[PDB]
Amino acid sequence: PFVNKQFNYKDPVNGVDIAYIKIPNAGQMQPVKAFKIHNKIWVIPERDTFTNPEEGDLNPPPEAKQVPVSYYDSTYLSTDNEKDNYLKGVTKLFERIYSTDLGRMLLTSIVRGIPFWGGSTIDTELKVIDTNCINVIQPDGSYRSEELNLVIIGPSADIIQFECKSFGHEVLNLTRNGYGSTQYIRFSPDFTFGFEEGAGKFATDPAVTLAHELIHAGHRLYGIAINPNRVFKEVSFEELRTFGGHDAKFIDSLQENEFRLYYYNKFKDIASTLNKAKSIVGTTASLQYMKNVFKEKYLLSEDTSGKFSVDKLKFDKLYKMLTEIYTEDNFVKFFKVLNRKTYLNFDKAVFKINIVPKVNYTIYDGFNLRNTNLAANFNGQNTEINNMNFTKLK
Ligand code: NI
Ligand SMILES: [Zn+2]
Secondary structure, rough: OOOOOOOOOOOOOOOOOOEEEOOOOOOOOOEEEEEEEEEEEEEEEEOOOOOOOOOOOOOOOOOOOOOOOOEEEEOOOHHHHHHHHHHHHHHHHHHHHHHHHHHHHHHHHHHHHOOOOOOOOOOOOEEEEEEEEEEEEEEOOOOEEEEEEEEEEEEOOEOOOOOOEOOOOOOOOOOOOOOOOOOEEEEOOOEEEEEEOOOOOOOOOHHHHHHHHHHHHHHHHHOOOOOOEEOOOEEHHHHHEEEEEHHHOOOOOOHHHHHHHHHHHHHHHHHHHHHHEEEEEEOOOOHHHHHHHHHHHHHEEEEOOOOOOOOOHHHHHHHOOOOOOHHHHHHHHHHOOOOOOOOOOOOOOOEEEOOOOOOOOOOEEEEEOOOOEEEOHHHHHHHHOOOHHEEOOO
16 A cells, blocks of 8 residues: 555665565475565565476467467566566555545555454464465575565566465465455556547556556455356356446356355354354464454454354345455446457557556556546557557567
């Protein structure tokens, strides 16, 4: 959200909000420089070779999809200057999202969405799940485990394949059992995608793209994501609800109620677990403090005795906010930008962009800069009218 510090990539490490860290992902990875831009939110200006052991190399595979479906450059985001621009780009997009009431609400929900402490085998002990933390190097070279909700990280091999990644549990389905897990969003502010509205060729505002992933992240942080195997005529349920607008109508109402009820019961389990709890692992967190943190997250009701329960009214509000109010469609309305009308894009294009310079893109106007000839008719997003801002890869 509000990012109160303007980071430069070369800013000196301080072990607090600028640090070298390691990701839970097994293997002895080299520590990477990361920046804490807000409570619970970090940015790692590196290509993601870390979250998936089968995706550790950036070269195009022999059978790669071609532009504009995929795009490959093993050297993208390999230099200090690129990483600085990436950090600054990602930060600007957070400000753009935060500048809307809707984005302010979403970013708040995200910060509150601490992944549940369901790490213990003793059903009376509260314990953090290791894969919801990062290890932060300290001055003496020791590591300090820090909980976090969200990491923005550079893309893996396919530069334009953005998505939410998270570490799984051996038995728990964290993004689908109400628990939640730290979300790693593969994202780049340095490219964007085209759509058609000889029809004009427009570019998606990167803030909409990022907001889209943040919506996925919200579902996944509250453990209410829909299994990708659930689709409607086909596109996944999870994508249709996230995109919103016209295409949401293809979601089966009954199926929608099934999941609302399902996740209702999942929240109830969480409340019972909290009630049961007697021990807690760690240091700066009292069990009372954590119970309160999760009361806050799941909007639980608490009686005089201190017992937790789920309020169906509060639950309905929260669920609707996360699944119906936070949509790409609704963000487009708040940004007042042009966006493709339907989830599936049959006229794709890919462009290199640079959002960082003020002459190019602003927190308040994106590409459609007020008091320029780019202000009207979404001229700023028109790849032919605003051609200096969009370099077509193919
Ligand atoms: Ni229709
Ligand atoms: Zn999506």
